[PDB]
Design a protein around this ligand. Structure first.
Ligand code: CHL
Ligand code: CLA
Ligand code: CLA
Ligand code: CLA
Ligand code: CLA
Ligand code: CLA
Ligand SMILES: CCCCCCCCCCCCCCCC(=O)OC[C@H](CO[C@@H]1O[C@H](CS(=O)(=O)O)[C@@H](O)[C@H](O)[C@H]1O)OC(=O)CCCCCCCCCCCCCCC
Ligand SMILES: CCCCCCCCCCCCCCCC(=O)OC[C@H](COP(=O)(O)OC[C@@H](O)CO)OC(=O)CCCCCCCCCCCCCCC
Ligand SMILES: CC(/C=C/C=C(C)/C=C/[C@@]12O[C@]1(C)C[C@@H](O)CC2(C)C)=C\C=C\C=C(C)\C=C\C=C(C)\C=C\[C@@]12O[C@]1(C)C[C@@H](O)CC2(C)C
Ligand SMILES: CC1=C[C@H](O)CC(C)(C)[C@H]1/C=C/C(C)=C/C=C/C(C)=C/C=C/C=C(C)/C=C/C=C(C)/C=C/C1=C(C)C[C@H](O)CC1(C)C
Ligand SMILES: CC1=C(/C=C/C(C)=C/C=C\C(C)=C\C=C\C=C(C)\C=C\C=C(C)\C=C\C2=C(C)CCCC2(C)C)C(C)(C)CCC1
Lengths: 211, 11, 82, 297, 499, 149, 134
């Protein structure tokens, strides 16, 4: 736990501006950007931090699942066609069965996680053979060799706050990427790589303003 | 007087 | 091409092609004319061949200089003369 | 599926890391040895791709297909050509899965194991090199080009046995663990040259056909085709640990434990069994060898 | 084209080194740079002549020219490059430039030394580019004094005995060569006779073919070590400075093979075709005898010398067993050995002079103080093990293929000789790793004091890397040294007459 | 010169010149169970390791660094070979006349002259590097004349 | 140092592109071990003009010779071991092929670009038919 208070250690998102006082910069990925001041009170602050982390991780997974199969279609062996139209793809089972199974299992898991949030340490999975003392928690970073078997979130590979900063920044970027992909498919009728190459060929004209 | 406690979280 | 061998125990078929560097065997020798860049890695400092823990520069000098023994016998003779 | 003309990137997939560490390990020894744990990620990831590029290469074979192979002439000189390339048949995909899975797992186990040690990066380089050599051996079209990888995995196993290179036993076991499979590859090369002279070709598509059906009568070669195959069998024996050549495995276990788990389930079994299993089309015409194999087993 | 290249390429080194004399400037400094610049200029001119003034598609001679020199016994400045010569010429320029670089920290004389280096340079290129038999002999014996001086001035403890044995032995060996010169020079001297190109059509009578063949073969077996004529090598290799020994055991040995290819197989076919099988037998037994006596030695310099001896059996067996590839795989072998043996002697001479212990029993754990030497030494040991990937493999493989598909054999020795040859692969690691294990592995005393123990600096490391990279580049795709279309005419003469 | 003598002759093939692996005075304490974690980053470590040679100093660096990105580009937007082999030619000359015109250091000269009474300084530095051809101090006739103050 | 036993492929001035000194292992006299190596060799000269069709065809006349000598010898060994009836048309086939090979070699020896391909078209058309009459 390292703090990033005002000064050179605090590169303000808006140069020449004093960041909101209740934005200390402890949470990695902070730059003093909350003009709406939603993080005014601490309970809301931590709640929004958890929401941000979850959104970032899910958005990373979603953008990977969009990107990789489409390029492996374009040039790779197997041809995974339009992902936006894969939502209605036909499988062995009906979409509602898939939906209810997803909801059951994810409700189980996310409910256990919800109780962990409301009551830290009271719902954890970390066995204890004798004489080896286990690690604690920092909710949002469960620890133990279930979700950190590489021993990366604790020390050695990088000071923690730096790696969490990497994570939150990449997650914000991935959120932008997902909303961009979706909005493009709303407007255009291709995948992300197709729009990409179309822009590469004609950067000067092949844009949103092409029509 | 020590004891064979568990190994790391990666093995 | 893509000949299709029906072997007597399995389900083969193959496809082959012949390739060889046309004349770039000249261009690779020209690029390996980078030994004319053996001058930046020679003007660099020598590891210890210039170190103070070295005096004598032959191929057996430092190793078989080793005849200060004769000079020491001569110094013994001189000290006896003293 | 047409996902074959891009499959050749399998045995070359981790390579873009190896050369990018050894250089650093030789030119700049005090910088790469300070990015210690980070270097684990670009490897365990890259090899991982290979695995997910192999199941889709194997699932196809499960659904029923036909095996492919690609040949390229890497020598056109006076009087005779030399080929290289690979093939993807059921056995290839089997051993491919079996090598990449245990590889991607032992990499993480090694990251856990060798964390207090000093030769972290060198260890990872050796592991990745052995892995990209074994992945090469299992996918290989003609005999000469499998011999090219046999001795490579032999040298990798050598460098891995005497890893710490300072325990005065690990310095006396690597030598034996090299000379034994050296005798093995000696027998392998003699058998290869014998079959070459007898049939005139090197690749399986022609060797299996010629050697089985068309061959002259007892111009003495019959004794040769009985003998030469015994030499290939001797090589496949020596890479594994059978009766006459087994004195290198017990002491070879002196090396580090992850290597002791990768040279007893990944190469010890593959380079031994796999070759015999692939050359089985030859040995059905030699009942003597069919009995001698069972006897030594 | 008529602007003479080979004349320049032969008279540039010795001339531009003659200016070292009559130049009072310093003790050691300026001479090193003035010599390395000349060496690099010569190498660049060599590669410029090769690239845009050569064809690779015609088996005649290129860039030839001649003059009138003594005119009584017809002996001209006749000079010309050809397919067989080109590889050895390039290898000589390369490895001798790198040897002159490796000779950087020599301050004992440093004026006679670099001049003698340039003289040996010019002599090697003169021989490898010769086109007139007497001029070939002149270039052959011209280098005999410079090498003796380099031996007797720098290198080893017992330099004198080695140097005198070497010089006497080589000078005596060249006597039979001069005998052959006098023999085939007087055979119808009106027909040019001393023009190595116009001798392809000579039809000598019987019982004279054999005598000239043997007069050349004895001299060659003297230069290129053959079993009963090898006793000189361990002394003149275990006592030479590594700078000398690099070019010595990487070029000067291969002259004995280049000459045997050029003047025996090209000029005296029915004197060589009735003598090939015994050459093959001798090479086959040499491959194992050299290794079996290498394992016995105890100072690693002589062990490296014997390892260099052993690989000279593949060249022999490739000269016999008359095929296109058997002769052609020999050239790749002389290149891939001029690399490996030279580098191994450089590494041996660089590890030593840091430890001052020659007997392989007291060498402790040198891996702890100096890692990079250990790495670049194990790598080239692997190369010498005929390990695949590196260029020490494909040469031996093509040699095997040449022996197997030979026409002058019917399956009886074509297999036993292959067997006795393959025993070399079982035998060589037994004596290479036995050195790698005694001298490097194990934990010696706490050799913490960083004095008289420093890893290779930039110069030596760059030399090692710059010689290593060609090995990989050739062993991965060997056809960077199969630019030889003379064998399609070299093995054209022999291929139908009797027997 | 004392050079004490030797002792009960050792195995010809002594397995590894080492202490026999009984008193190997730590297993795993000499190579593996050893490391911690201290300091020093990456880039300030690289650009503190390319400067333990002062490899070039000034102009002699510009002509040595901008050369490879001019002889790798050369194999593109192709230019005739003659141009390419006079480029490398004029390099090997310009780089040479700057090297041989650098000062001299004590380790360069003879062994018998390397070991003076620390009057080597004013005999070589600012004495050799301040003249062209004077040979007033021509003491390369070794009998220990030393011909200096 | 090797002879032929059916002298009808030798055209006027009986010779060809052939490069003697190539080792061809014994396969036994049969119209099954020759119609197979002839196929698996005539398969290569299809794959010849894939990469080395253009781009400095100075190795093409170093590999066509090689992988056509096999055809030239094995086709004779075959045309011997056949019944009287199938011999005239197989021989006619032989004639058109081993003339197109000489034509192709002589055209590629000139280091052209379009003449090489135009001539190779014919030996491909004929040589794709050799892999069927077997
Ligand atoms: C919660 C995340 C989620 C997202 C981003 C999508 C994405 C989409 N789904 Mg959907 N789905 C999602 C949940 C699920 N879908 C499905 C199964 C289907 C089907 C069968 C279809 C969609 C369709 C759609 C589209 C509806 C248009 C829209 O969003 O209006 C704003 C859109 C592309 C339709 C579509 O893609 O047509 C173009 C469609 O037919 N989805 C299941 C059951 C497995 C879900 C369970 O979570
Ligand atoms: C729904 C997603 C989500 C949620 C819950 C949050 C939540 C939060 N963000 Mg945030 N953010 C997001 C997406 C999200 N962010 C994206 C996509 C971007 C990129 C445009 C950003 C860029 C961003 C900046 C630049 C800053 C925040 C900050 C904050 C905190 C106030 C709060 C924890 C502030 C903070 O305190 O940092 C942690 C802050 O300075 N965010
Ligand atoms: C029945 C299933 C179920 C249930 C009970 C919950 C329940 C909850 N979710 Mg949740 N969630 C689910 C499925 C579910 N989720 C699925 C399928 C996704 C991916 C589409 C998400 C993505 C998600 C995010 C991104 C976030 C939640 C949050 C929350 C909270 C609450 C405990 C929020 C949370 O953890 O509080 C901050 C939050 O930010 N969920
Ligand atoms: C973010 C969540 C997410 C979601 C909801 C989906 C949804 C889907 N993926 Mg998917 N995928 C994702 C992320 C995601 N992907 C990521 C991050 C990757 C890695 C790049 C993949 C890689 C991937 C592959 C390789 C395949 C799918 C396929 C599918 C479809 C059927 C699932 C199936 O049969 O596979 C079952 C696979 C299991 C491992 C179970 C479905 C539309 C499949 C498809 O397109 O239909 C054939 C398919 O073959 N996905
Ligand atoms: C990207 C980056 C740079 C990180 C970085 C990190 N993650 Mg993380 N993560 C990501 C994506 C990323 N994650 C995604 C997409 C998911 C969803 C699968 C997760 C799920 C996740 C968990 C569940 C955990 C981490 C943990 C960690 C830390 C180790 C480190 C801060 C661990 C940690 O810090 O715990 C101590 C941890 O427990 N992350
Ligand atoms: C990571 C952010 C990102 C990137 C790299 C792209 C890239 C692209 N978009 Mg896009 N887009 C984005 C976000 C992004 N978008 C978002 C958030 C939306 C929702 C409003 C859209 C909606 C959208 C539509 C409707 C269309 C594109 C299209 C395109 C392509 C042509 C460029 C163009 O005309 O659109 C320019 C894109 C915008 C004006 C969107 C503005 C929003 C982004 C975030 C701008 C901010 C820049 C970013 C933060 C800085 C770079 C970050 C990183 C990449 C280095 C191009 C590949 C077109 C297409 O399909 O290609 C043929 C098209 O028709 N975009
Ligand atoms: C296409 C065909 C290609 C064929 C290629 C064949 C290449 C064969 C290479 C053989 C290399 C043999 C090395 C033996 C071990 C050694 O000498 O290490 C000692 C030093 C430094 O090791 C140092 O050793 C340190 C431990 S210690 O300090 O020495 O105790 C530790 O920090 C770490 O190991 C390292 O820093 O050498 C190296 O480790 C360099 C490793 C390069 C490995 C590349 C493999 C590919
Ligand atoms: C719209 C969405 C914008 C998201 C920006 C952050 C992405 C996620 C993220 O964290 O990216 C990180 C990215 C780089 O910031 P750094 O980590 O380099 O900041 C550290 C400082 O020392 C500056 O380097 O920040 C920005 O993109 C600033 C954008 C300025 C405003 C846009 C400029 C466009 C030109
Ligand atoms: C961008 C985003 C939210 C951004 C919010 C921002 C910036 C708020 C910023 C502010 O508050 C601050 C910071 C400070 C305030 O003072 C100022 C403002 C400005 C008010 C969420 C994206 C969130 C993105 C999310 C949650 C991604 C969800 C992923 C899904 C649904 C997966 C879908 C798929 O799985 C299917 C359905 C089928 C597969 O075939 C395809 C895939 C894609 C794999
Ligand atoms: C828009 C657009 C448009 C156009 O068209 C084009 C373009 C430009 C391309 C586009 C863009 C896009 C983008 C931006 C994207 C991004 C993404 C991301 C960031 C992702 C992440 C992503 C991320 C990710 C995946 C991550 C992940 C992670 C993970 C799993 C981890 C795991 C782990 C853990 C926990 C722990 C343990 O012990 C170990 C490990 C293993 C370590
Ligand atoms: C791969 C894939 C994917 C995904 C996947 C997933 C997402 C999964 C998830 C999830 C899951 C997978 C889940 C599951 C869950 C659940 C669980 C895991 C449960 C458990 C339970 C239990 C354990 C219980 C117990 C009990 C009982 C019963 C008795 C009483 C008591 C108790 C409670 C204890 C993606 C992206 C899509 C796409 C592609 C494919």
């Amino acid at each position: 736990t390292v703090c990033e208070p005002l000064g050179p250690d605090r590169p303000v998102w808006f140069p020449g501006t004093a960041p909101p006082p209740w934005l200390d910069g402890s949470l990695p990925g902070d730059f003093g950007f909350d003009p709406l001041g939603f993080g005014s009170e601490p309970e809301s602050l931590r709640w929004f931090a958890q929401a941000e982390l979850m959104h970032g991780r899910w958005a990373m997974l979603a953008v990977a699942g969009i990107l990789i199969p489409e390029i492996l279609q374009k040039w790779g062996f197997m041809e995974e066609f339009s992902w936006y139209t894969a939502g209605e793809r036909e499988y062995f089972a009906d979409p509602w069965t898939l939906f209810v199974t997803q909801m059951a299992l994810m409700g189980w898991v996310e409910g256990r996680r919800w109780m962990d949030y409301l009551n830290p340490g009271s719902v954890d999975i970390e066995p204890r053979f004798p004489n080896r003392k286990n690690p604690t928690p920092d909710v949002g970073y469960p620890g133990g060799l279930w979700f950190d078997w590489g021993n990366w979130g604790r020390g050695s590979p990088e000071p923690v706050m730096v790696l969490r900063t990497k994570e939150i920044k990449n997650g914000r970027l991935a959120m932008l990427a997902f909303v961009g992909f979706w909005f493009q498919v709303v407007y255009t009728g291709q995948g992300p790589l197709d729009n990409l190459f179309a822009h590469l060929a004609d950067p000067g004209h092949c844009n949103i303003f092409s029509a | 007087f020590a004891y064979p406690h568990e190994t790391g979280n990666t093995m | 091409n893509q000949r299709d061998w029906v072997v007597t125990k399995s389900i083969w078929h193959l496809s082959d092609t012949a390739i060889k560097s046309f004349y770039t065997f000249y261009a690779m020798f020209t690029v390996w004319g980078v030994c004319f860049f053996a001058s930046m890695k020679a003007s660099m400092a020598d590891p210890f061949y210039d170190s103070e823990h070295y005096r004598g520069q032959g191929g057996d000098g430092t190793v078989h200089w080793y005849y200060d023994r004769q000079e020491d016998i001569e110094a013994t003779a001189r000290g006896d003369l003293l | 599926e047409h996902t074959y003309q891009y499959a050749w990137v399998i045995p070359l997939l981790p390579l873009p890391v190896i050369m990018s560490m050894g250089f650093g390990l030789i030119l700049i020894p005090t910088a790469t040895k300070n990015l210690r744990r980070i270097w684990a990620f670009p490897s365990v990831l890259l090899l991982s791709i290979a695995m997910v590029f192999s199941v889709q290469l194997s699932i196809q074979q499960i659904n029923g297909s036909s095996i492919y192979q690609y040949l390229w002439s890497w020598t056109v000189n006076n009087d005779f050509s030399l080929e290289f390339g690979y093939l993807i048949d059921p056995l290839t995909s089997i051993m491919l899965i079996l090598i990449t899975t245990v590889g991607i797992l032992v990499l993480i186990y090694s990251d856990g194991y060798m964390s207090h040690d000093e030769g972290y990066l060198r260890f990872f380089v050796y592991i990745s090199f052995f892995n990209t050599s074994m992945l090469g051996l299992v996918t290989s079209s003609n005999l000469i080009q499998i011999y090219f990888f046999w001795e490579l995995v032999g040298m990798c196993s050598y460098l891995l046995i005497g890893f710490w290179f300072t325990r005065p036993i690990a310095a006396s076991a690597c030598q034996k663990a090299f000379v034994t499979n050296r005798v093995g590859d000696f027998g392998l090369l003699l058998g290869i040259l014998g079959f070459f002279w007898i049939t005139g070709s090197l690749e399986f598509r022609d060797l299996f056909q010629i050697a089985n059906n068309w061959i002259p009568n007892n111009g003495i070669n019959s004794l040769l085709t009985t003998l030469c195959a015994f030499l290939l069998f001797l090589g496949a024996v020596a890479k594994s640990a059978q009766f006459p050549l087994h004195v290198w495995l017990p002491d070879a276990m002196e090396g580090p434990t992850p290597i002791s788990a990768l040279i007893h389930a990944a190469t010890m079994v593959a380079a031994g069994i796999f070759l015999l299993a692939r050359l089985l089309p030859l040995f059905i015409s030699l009942p003597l060898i069919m009995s001698f194999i069972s006897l030594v087993g | 084209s008529y602007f003479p290249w080979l004349t320049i390429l032969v008279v540039l080194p010795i001339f531009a080194g003659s200016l070292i004399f009559f130049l009072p400037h310093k003790g050691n400094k300026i001479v090193r740079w003035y010599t390395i610049s000349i060496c690099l200029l010569e190498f660049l001119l060599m590669t410029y002549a090769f690239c845009y003034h050569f064809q690779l598609e015609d088996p005649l001679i290129q860039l030839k020219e001649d003059y009138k020199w003594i005119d009584v016994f017809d002996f001209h400045w006749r000079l010309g490059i050809d397919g067989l010569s080109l590889g050895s010429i390039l290898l000589t320029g390369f490895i001798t430039t790198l040897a002159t670089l490796a000779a950087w920290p020599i301050t004992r004389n440093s004026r006679l030394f670099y001049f003698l280096m340039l003289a040996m340079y010019s002599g090697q290129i003169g021989l490898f580019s010769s086109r007139d038999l007497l001029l070939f002999f002149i270039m052959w014996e011209l280098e005999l004094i410079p090498v003796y001086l380099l031996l007797s001035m720098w290198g080893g403890k017992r330099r004198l005995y080695s140097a005198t044995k070497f010089i006497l032995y080589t000078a005596g060996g060249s006597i039979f060569f001069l005998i052959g010169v006098l023999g085939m020079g007087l055979y119808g001297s009106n027909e040019p006779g001393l023009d190595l190109e116009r001798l392809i059509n000579q039809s000598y009578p019987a019982t004279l073919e054999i005598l000239l063949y043997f007069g050349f073969l004895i001299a060659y077996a003297v230069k290129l070590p053959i079993i009963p004529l090898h006793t000189w090598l361990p002394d003149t290799h275990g006592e030479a400075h590594y700078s000398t020994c690099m070019l010595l055991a990487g070029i000067l040995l291969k002259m004995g093979a280049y000459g045997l290819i050029r003047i025996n197989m090209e000029l005296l076919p029915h004197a060589h075709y009735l003598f090939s099988p015994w050459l093959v037998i001798i090479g086959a037994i040499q491959i194992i005898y050299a290794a079996s006596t290498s394992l016995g030695q105890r100072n690693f310099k002589k062990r490296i010398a014997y390892s260099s001896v052993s690989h000279m059996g593949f060249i022999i067996i490739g000269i016999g067993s008359i095929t296109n590839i058997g002769l052609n795989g020999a050239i790749l072998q002389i290149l891939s050995h001029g690399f490996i043996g030279a580098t191994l002697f450089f590494l041996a001479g660089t590890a030593s002079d840091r430890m001052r212990l020659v007997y392989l029993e007291e060498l402790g754990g040198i891996s702890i103080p100096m890692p990079k030497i250990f790495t670049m030494f194990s790598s080239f040991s692997m190369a010498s093990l005929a390990l695949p990937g590196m260029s020490g493999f494909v040469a031996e493989l093509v040699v095997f293929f040449g022996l197997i598909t030979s026409p002058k054999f019917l399956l009886m020795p074509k297999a036993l000789i292959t067997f006795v040859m393959a025993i070399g692969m079982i035998l060589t690691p037994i004596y290479l790793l036995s050195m790698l294990r005694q001298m490097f592995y194990g934990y010696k005393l706490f050799n913490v004091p960083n004095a008289n123990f420093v890893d290779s600096g930039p110069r030596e490391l760059f030399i090692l890397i710059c010689i290593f990279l060609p090995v990989i580049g050739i062993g991965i795709y060997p056809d960077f040294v199969l630019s030889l279309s003379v064998d399609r005419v070299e093995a054209l003469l022999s291929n139908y007459y009797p027997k | 010169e004392p050079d004490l003598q030797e002792d009960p002759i050792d195995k010809w093939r002594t397995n590894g010149v080492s202490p026999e692996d009984f008193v190997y005075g730590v297993y795993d304490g000499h190579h593996t169970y050893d490391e911690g974690q201290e300091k020093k980053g990456f880039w300030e470590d690289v650009s503190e390791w390319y400067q333990e040679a002062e490899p070039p100093q000034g102009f002699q660096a510009l002509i040595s660094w901008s050369f490879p990105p001019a002889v790798i580009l050369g194999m593109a937007f192709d230019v005739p070979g003659e141009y390419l082999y006079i480029g490398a030619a004029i390099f090997i000359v310009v780089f040479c006349i700057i090297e041989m015109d650098k000062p001299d250091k004590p380790h360069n000269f003879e062994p018998e002259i390397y070991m003076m009474e620390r009057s080597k300084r004013d005999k070589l530095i600012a004495d050799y590097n301040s003249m062209d051809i004077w040979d007033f101090n021509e003491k390369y006739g070794e009998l220990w004349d030393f011909t200096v103050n | 140092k090797i002879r032929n036993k059916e002298i009808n492929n030798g055209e006027t001035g009986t010779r060809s592109f052939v490069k003697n000194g190539i080792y061809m292992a014994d396969i036994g006299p049969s119209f099954a071990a020759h119609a197979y190596r002839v196929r698996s060799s005539a398969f290569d000269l299809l794959a010849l003009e894939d990469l080395l069709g253009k781009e400095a065809s100075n190795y093409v006349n170093k590999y066509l010779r090689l992988k056509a000598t096999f055809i030239y010898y094995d086709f004779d060994k075959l045309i011997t071991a056949a019944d009287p009836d199938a011999k005239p048309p197989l021989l006619d086939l032989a004639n058109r092929l081993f003339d197109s090979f000489e034509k192709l070699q002589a055209a590629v020896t000139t280091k052209d670009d379009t003449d090489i391909g135009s001539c190779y078209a014919d030996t491909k058309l004929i040589l794709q038919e050799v892999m069927t009459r077997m």
